[PDB]
Amino acid sequence: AQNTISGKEGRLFLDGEEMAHIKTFEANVEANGTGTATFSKFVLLMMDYVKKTLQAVLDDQSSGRGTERVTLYDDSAKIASLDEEEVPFTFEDFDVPEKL
């Protein structure tokens, strides 16, 4: 429900390579969880990777503090990706390490 989490403009890295400037994304801590996000070659490349680390900028308007980075630590999908924009994904842990 409101146990949601989402963040503006982000980038996902496959073991070090940036692979898609993923825009709006919105997860759901179930810190394992499910979520969704919308995303050139590189990006798409990165997507195929996350299919098989998404580091964005948190968009909590409440601003309990200010604005921090959010990372989302951690095959059908792989095939769907062979050709809507809201793609599903399932991180295994989330985090808000630094401010900004």
Give me 30's structure tokens.
């179930």
Distance CA(59)–CA(62), nearest Å, equals 9
Query: Which of 15, 16, 61, 75 lies at the binding interface for a second copy (CB under 8 A)?
Result: 61
Tokens 């195929």 locate to: 48
* 31 contacts a second copy (rule: CB under 8 A): yes
Strands (E), the chain: 4-14, 17-18, 25-29, 33-38, 54-58, 69-73, 86-89, 93-95
Q: Is 32 in the site for a second copy (CB under 8 A)?
A: yes
- Does 53 participate in binding a second copy (rule CB under 8 A)? no
| Beta carbons within 10 angstroms of residue 37's beta carbon | 25
Contact present, 42 and 8 (Cβ < 8 Å):
no
Asked if 74 interacts with a second copy (CB under 8 A), we say no
Judged by CB under 8 A, the number of residues near a second copy is 59
Shortest separation between residue 26's beta carbon and a second copy, angstroms:
9
CB nearer a second copy, residue 65 or residue 74: 65
Residues that bind a second copy (CB under 8 A): 1-6, 9-12, 18-24, 27-33, 36-47, 58, 60-68, 70, 80-88, 94, 96, 99
